[PDB]
Amino acid sequence: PALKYGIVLDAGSSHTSMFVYKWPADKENDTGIVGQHSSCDVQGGGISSYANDPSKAGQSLVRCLEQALRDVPRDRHASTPLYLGATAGMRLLNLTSPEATARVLEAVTQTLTQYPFDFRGARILSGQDEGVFGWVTANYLLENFIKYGWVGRWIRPRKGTLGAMDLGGASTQITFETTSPSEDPGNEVHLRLYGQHYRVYTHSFLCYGRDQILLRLLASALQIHRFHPCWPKGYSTQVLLQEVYQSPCTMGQSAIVSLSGTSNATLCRDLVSRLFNISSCPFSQCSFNGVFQPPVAGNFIAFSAFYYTVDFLTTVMGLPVGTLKQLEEATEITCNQTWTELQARVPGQKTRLADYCAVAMFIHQLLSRGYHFDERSFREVVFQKKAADTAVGWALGYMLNLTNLIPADLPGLRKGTHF
């Protein structure tokens, strides 16, 4: 009946989103109890985009914080924790300039401390944090941490958990429960949740988020082709080369150049393939780029840009994506469309329309060549962005952790009945 609230600002690479959560005060330690109350998307770029004008990073938040004042009851403002967590955009800016990164964190801090909420800090999450907290969000919301059965008849094996795949703008994470031995400590995660131990694998591929992959494909196309095979025939734009090569993701790869699309699904496939280095593995088994990965297993939820890209293929292109072969065929069809043909399918705003080919190709290869899903394991992947009226991402897991809302053990160890 009486509710408590908490707020997370997800400071992502392309933009900031605010989530307000609520829960009953006298059931707050039950799994699946916390749920989303409201949300707000901050106008303009991510906080890292203000690296040279850090004051604007704090000001960017004001409109959404004003909404938070209206969404959370007044008498609760003071006891509502507020967190900001920043991900790969700020990790990348920290490589370029720790000083600029610090000024941006200082600016958002200054703004947030002016509000009546219990501000608990602005922090940059690690890649492991980001992966693990998204896995917690999904499994918390779907009540996978409940111990199913009853005395004398507990289900065995215990309830499975949902793997998580998150495609952000500047990194992508894969996280799942595994029985495989750990071969790299950087990928090894151990959780104690509701008296149960979960052995988890996680990895974050920095520079493999949607926006950085598009930049890297553009840089590659400029070098190899001087046309862009992933872009549709009839689409062209003036490319500012400074913007192409300024990222840590592309600096490894004449002020302005014209670049035109060619709708070449096969050349687009070849361009995307160059993103995955499969030449070496110092472990028993790898994903790509020499990174340890055990075999994928269990159900998975693919959210964020995986969901938005696949939704374009099914809803706008009207193509099935149920199998890896179907996803590949949909991508080929989409890439082979001319700019007029693509525009004919989208009566409204056309931002990002020239990018779905490249992003769909990337996703198909990431899953199939990168993570080594096959038809059998892919059948167990679902593309969804919401569970139990709450957006799926790392924000909820993060809040749950920092607010100590998930118990490591059940009260009084449930008298030992789960032993």
Overall description:
This protein has a 6-stranded mixed β-sheet. By secondary structure, it is of the alpha/beta class. The longest helix is centred in the first third of the chain and has 15 residues, at 98-112. A hairpin with a 3-residue loop joins strand 8 (163-167) and strand 9. The protein has 2 domains: 1-125 and 389-419, ATPase, nucleotide binding domain (Nucleotidyltransferase, domain 5); 126-388, 2-Layer Sandwich (Nucleotidyltransferase, domain 5), CATH 3.30.420. The chain starts with a strand and ends in a 17-residue tail after the last helix. It is 35% helix and 24% strand. Helix 4 crosses helix 5 (98-112), helix 9 crosses helix 13 (356-370) and helix 10 packs across helix 13. It is globular and about 70 Å long.
**Radius of gyration over alpha carbons?**
22 Å
Q: Please state the structural category.
A: alpha/beta
Write out the strand line-up for the largest beta sheet, numbering strands in chain order. Answer: 10-11-9-8-15-16
**What is the class of the largest domain in the CATH system?**
Alpha Beta
